[PDB]
Amino acid sequence: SQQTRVLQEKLRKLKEAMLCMVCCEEEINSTFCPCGHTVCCESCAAQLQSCPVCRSRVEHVQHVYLPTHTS
Numbered sequence: 001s002q003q004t005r006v007l008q009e010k011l012r013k014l015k016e017a018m019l020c021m022v023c024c025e026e027e028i029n030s031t032f033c034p035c036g037h038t039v040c041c042e043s044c045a046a047q048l049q050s051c052p053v054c055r056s057r058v059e060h061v062q063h064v065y066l067p068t069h070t071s
C-alpha cells in the first residue's frame with residue numbers, strides 16, 4: 001500500500017539518523033567530550049580536533065554503548 005512506502009521512508013530516515021554524520025557508513029558510537037555531541041563513528045571521531053556540530057574543542061572521545069547498536 002501507500003502506507004508501506006511511507007513507513008519504509010520513516011524507517012530509513014530513523015536508521016540514517018543513527019549513522020555517522022561524516023562518513024554516512026558506520027553507526028554512531030562516539031561522544032565528543034565535554035560538549036556531548038554524539039554524531040560520529042569512532043573512526044571519524046578520532047580524526048576531529050573540534051566538534052563538527054558546535055566547534056568546541058574535543059578534550060576526548062567517549063565510546064557509547066547504546067541499546068540500538070547492531071552488527
Ligand SMILES: [Zn+2]
Pocket residue numbers: 020021022023024025026040041042043044045
Ligand atoms: Zn564515520
Ligand SMILES: [Zn+2]
Pocket residue numbers: 032035036037051052053054055056
Ligand atoms: Zn559539540
Ligand SMILES: [Zn+2]
Pocket residue numbers: none
Ligand atoms: Zn556500564
